[PDB]
Amino acid sequence: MDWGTLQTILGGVNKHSTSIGKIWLTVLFIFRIMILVVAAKEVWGDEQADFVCNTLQPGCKNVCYDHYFPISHIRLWALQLIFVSTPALLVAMHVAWTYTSSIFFRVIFEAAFMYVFYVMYDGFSMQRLVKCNAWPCPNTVDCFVSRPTEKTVFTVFMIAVSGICILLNVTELSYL
Amino acid sequence: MDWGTLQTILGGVNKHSTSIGKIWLTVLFIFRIMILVVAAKEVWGDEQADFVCNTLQPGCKNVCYDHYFPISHIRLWALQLIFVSTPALLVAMHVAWTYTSSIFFRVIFEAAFMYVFYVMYDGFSMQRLVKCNAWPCPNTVDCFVSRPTEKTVFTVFMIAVSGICILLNVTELSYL
């Protein structure tokens, strides 16, 4: 891939005691894109052949995999970014009803993804072994995970990023 | 094999209103020997490669096999017969402290094997699937059996035989 190949005329800088946010926020935008693609198919890209189930039950790997991973972290992120992406191309150029409502959209989205995330991954963690007692899964069986530490780390990162994103997003939203 | 090849001089028969038992009891003795050897290594002779455990746990077949089959039925029988065998060669010829105590021994042994049996195989049955949650057996796993019906049948037989053995054994023990 390659994303962004024309940014040369940016001599105009800020002078006020504000609009520091847009710097921080474009930086976090670009950042999160890199951070994503660089580790995109490279942490969670694997986790299909990595959910070993101690059994001889047919299918129970698939069963428990959806049971505990309806969706992977990186998708909720990918979405979180895209919904939080549309205000970016908006704020690309501003001076001359929406504009600040773009800022607010950007806030509330990111908030939503945080909440529903912690609803799903309660404990902000990756259990080393998830058991499973699904229908075909004849009793409570065991179902492993690879690299739970890893995924936990990058999750801590992205959530911290979400917090700072919103804090400057809102710190300039709160101009009154 | 071949067991018993000299029995010709038995013209002397009983005339009293008793000693019918010794007929019945020698018949049951010979019977149970045949009944055994004919189906000896031929119902329970197999059951080593016949205890399938749905798992990928190493050893868990052996583990659960001993767990649920410390010993097979046919051994408890084999013993039951042998302990109940010694009074037979005694009562081979009788007329002329032990003699009736042989009869009583024969009773109480067979009783013991009945009790301890039902202690172990509670329900007078063969479960089609025994689960298992042993140490190495990581969770409650499944562990199959072959021919549980079969073994149940022949068990019903041998226990009925035990009952009749004792009933005539004792009916002549109860002479007063």
From Swiss-Prot, chains A, B:
It is a multi-pass membrane protein. Residues 2-13 dip into the membrane without crossing it. Changing residue 84 to M: In DFNB1A; the mutant disrupts cellular communication. GO terms for biological process: cell-cell signaling; gap junction assembly; gap junction-mediated intercellular transport; sensory perception of sound; transmembrane transport. Changing residue 66 to H: In VOWNKL and PPKDFN; impairs trafficking; localizes intracellularly closed to the nucleus; affects the ability to form functional channels; phenotype can be rescued by coexpression with wild-type protein. The chain crosses the membrane at residues 21-40, 74-94, 99-119, 153-173. Changing residue 84 to L: In DFNB1A; sorted to the plasma membrane normally and forms gap junctions that were morphologically and electrically indistinguishable from those of control; the mutation reduces the permeability of GJB2 gap junction channels to inositol 1,4,5-trisphosphate (Ins(1,4,5)P3), resulting in blockade of the Ins(1,4,5)P3-induced inward calcium current in neighboring cells. Residues 41-73, 120-152 are extracellular. Changing residue 131 to R: In a patient with congenital erythrokeratodermia; uncertain significance. Residues 14-20 are cytoplasmic. It comes from the Eukaryota. The keyword Membrane applies. Coiled coil: none annotated. Disulfide bonds join 53-143, 60-137, 64-132. One of its GO terms (cellular component) is endoplasmic reticulum-Golgi intermediate compartment. It is found in: Cell membrane; Cell junction, Gap junction. Ca(2+) binds at residues 42, 45, 47. Changing residue 73 to R: In PPKDFN; the mutant has a dominant-negative effect on connexin trafficking. The keyword Metal-binding applies. Gene3D superfamilies: Gap junction channel protein cysteine-rich domain (1.20.1440.80). A hemichannel or connexon is composed of a hexamer of connexins. A functional gap junction is formed by the apposition of two hemichannels. Interacts with CNST. Forms heteromeric channels with GJB4. It is linked to Deafness, autosomal recessive, 1A: A form of non-syndromic sensorineural hearing loss. Sensorineural deafness results from damage to the neural receptors of the inner ear, the nerve pathways to the brain, or the area of the brain that receives sound information. Structural component of gap junctions. Gap junctions are dodecameric channels that connect the cytoplasm of adjoining cells. They are formed by the docking of two hexameric hemichannels, one from each cell membrane. Small molecules and ions diffuse from one cell to a neighboring cell via the central pore. Belongs to the connexin family. Beta-type (group I) subfamily. This is Gap junction beta-2 protein.
